[PDB]
Enzyme design. Sequence first.
Site, PDB file in Angstrom:
ATOM      1  N   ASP A  45      66.754  22.797 -32.319  1.00  0.00           N
ATOM      2  CA  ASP A  45      66.277  23.532 -31.146  1.00  0.00           C
ATOM      3  C   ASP A  45      65.875  24.926 -31.630  1.00  0.00           C
ATOM      4  OD1 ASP A  45      66.290  23.241 -27.950  1.00  0.00           O
ATOM      5  OD2 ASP A  45      67.086  25.201 -28.476  1.00  0.00           O
ATOM      6  N   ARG A  46      66.384  26.007 -31.032  1.00  0.00           N
ATOM      7  CA  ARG A  46      65.933  27.348 -31.406  1.00  0.00           C
ATOM      8  C   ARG A  46      66.178  27.617 -32.880  1.00  0.00           C
ATOM      9  NH1 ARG A  46      62.587  27.897 -27.741  1.00  0.00           N
ATOM     10  NH2 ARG A  46      62.420  30.152 -28.173  1.00  0.00           N
TER      11      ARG A  46
ATOM     12  N   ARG B  53      63.555  26.380 -34.894  1.00  0.00           N
ATOM     13  CA  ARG B  53      62.381  27.248 -34.851  1.00  0.00           C
ATOM     14  C   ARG B  53      62.527  28.411 -35.814  1.00  0.00           C
ATOM     15  NH1 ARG B  53      59.601  25.113 -31.128  1.00  0.00           N
ATOM     16  NH2 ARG B  53      60.746  23.711 -29.719  1.00  0.00           N
TER      17      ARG B  53
ATOM     18  N   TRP C 262      60.747  27.038 -20.757  1.00  0.00           N
ATOM     19  CA  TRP C 262      59.934  27.829 -21.674  1.00  0.00           C
ATOM     20  C   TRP C 262      59.144  28.894 -20.935  1.00  0.00           C
ATOM     21  CZ3 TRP C 262      57.871  26.700 -26.940  1.00  0.00           C
ATOM     22  CH2 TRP C 262      58.858  26.091 -27.715  1.00  0.00           C
TER      23      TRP C 262
ATOM     24  N   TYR D 241      63.462  33.245 -25.606  1.00  0.00           N
ATOM     25  CA  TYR D 241      62.369  32.493 -25.007  1.00  0.00           C
ATOM     26  C   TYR D 241      61.163  33.371 -24.713  1.00  0.00           C
ATOM     27  CZ  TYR D 241      64.735  28.079 -24.756  1.00  0.00           C
ATOM     28  OH  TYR D 241      65.332  26.892 -25.086  1.00  0.00           O
TER      29      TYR D 241
ATOM     30  N   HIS E  71      68.278  15.046 -26.726  1.00  0.00           N
ATOM     31  CA  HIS E  71      67.922  16.228 -27.489  1.00  0.00           C
ATOM     32  C   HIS E  71      69.017  16.650 -28.464  1.00  0.00           C
ATOM     33  CE1 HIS E  71      66.083  19.954 -28.531  1.00  0.00           C
ATOM     34  NE2 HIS E  71      67.016  20.683 -27.943  1.00  0.00           N
TER      35      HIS E  71
END
EC number: 3.8.1.3
Lengths: 298, 297
Positions: free
Chosen positions: A108-109, A112, A154, A217, A278
């Site tokens: 997830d984050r 990223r 988002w 975000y 997820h």
Amino acid sequence: DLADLFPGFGSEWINTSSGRIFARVGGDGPPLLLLHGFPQTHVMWHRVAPKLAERFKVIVADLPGYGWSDMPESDEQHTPYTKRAMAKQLIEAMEQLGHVHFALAGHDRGARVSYRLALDSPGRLSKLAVLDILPTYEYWQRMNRAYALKIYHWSFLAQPAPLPENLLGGDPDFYVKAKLASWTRAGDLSAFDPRAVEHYRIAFADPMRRHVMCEDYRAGAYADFEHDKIDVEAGNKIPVPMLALWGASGIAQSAATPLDVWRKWASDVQGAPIESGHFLPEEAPDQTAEALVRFFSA
Amino acid sequence: DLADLFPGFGSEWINTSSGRIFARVGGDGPPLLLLHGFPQTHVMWHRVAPKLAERFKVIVADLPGYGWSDMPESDEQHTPYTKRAMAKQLIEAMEQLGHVHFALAGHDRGARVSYRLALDSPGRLSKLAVLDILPTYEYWQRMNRAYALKIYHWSFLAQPAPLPENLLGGDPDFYVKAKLASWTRAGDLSAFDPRAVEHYRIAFADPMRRHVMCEDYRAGAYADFEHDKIDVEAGNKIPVPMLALWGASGIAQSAATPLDVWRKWASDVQGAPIESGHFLPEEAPDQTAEALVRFFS
């Protein structure tokens, strides 16, 4: 009263120029950094890290501003919560441990942060694993009705402060549990260890933590997208061998095929669907750990 | 408590199969139905309805589920809060007053009811005005990163219950005032009559009303979209002569050039920007009122 979900792991407060990263550290061998995402903390790795720690020095870090890591003051550009800044901070964190070349798995984050780290500083990474993400650019570029509804947060969390912060404050316990449940295969909290859920719920109960997540975000809507765009436009590919894992019913698979997306972003990518929602390391820990062990070891 | 912002207007509770529609009624002449949107009630017309009442029988109705109108219980398809259902319910309401052929001006959600009314039952409409909207299909079809950030509430309020409801419930006043302010030219509440703001806030303070608004937006993300999609893909055009008004700084202009979009949806559409944010009748009452009077006259 928060449970210790990594027995035998040490607990490191690791200084950086932007604040401390909290990390559980266990095992021996090549360093492997594990990065959580939203709305979780490092403890999301608690089912996978012991099997990784059989072969790796596993560093299970709270993202900057998440969990127990310090919260850098943000700015108008949400700079400290851009994946570029977060990546730099974690690189600095790893250097504090003597780790200038490490394996990295993000969810997830944190995934990223992970691929942005690989784009900005590929020399730091031996191998990269991303769990159930496509690059932020791809989410925004495939933004349509279906995606907008599915990943509404988002756009919602990217709204200017304090709109998401005030709304999140309306029912933070509900919201964090709602996100956890809604993104699993089961659709409830049964895939999670309740003590892990408690970690996520306490983290989410802190208004300052929630603000950080909104900053994350906001970054993801602006600077992170702009950074990714530069790489797309320059044709910059991740040269690190990478593994893309995605849940069969995760955020990334519907309307894409993550591997064919990541092949646009990385020269050398393997991928596999995991029968999971997820939260791959918690919904399908054995499958996830096996694929991570296999990919990171040889 | 709440101020009467339509001095001399009557008050009507119109019974329909799907619940009572509240309406202020005033003026005389051809029937003109005015429909508000989110997060407002019929009182948003209070600065333009008097001018319209000099020329028309003005019916200022709370949308089904909004304001003082009854709230039909929704279902898994958000059926009562689809614009098709709302239009059929308002047709029923107007029939109760003997208005089977009427002019219609809608703003925001009420404009979505209005153009849906015009596609479903154009024979009911003499003329149609839509204020600061594009068709729901067009918003979703232009839902890229820029627009998804601008109208995030389209996706946020469409999340399955009770997620938006639970978040909105912690501080309802903050959200309704945030929405009114953010869509104005000025970005504050200066354009609104404080008494009007109180109507909006009071309506928004009711959890069932908020649920209805989320149902409205859920319909907007699903059934409304599907209904629009059918019409646009069938080339079904609004045959009723229509006026598209948008604010130069309103929502509609962000997605696309409004008149260009509406010509794809309407065979007879004229359009005029008004220097206003989203809330044309309140930010720009004289300009809006003049455009509406000119068009409907």
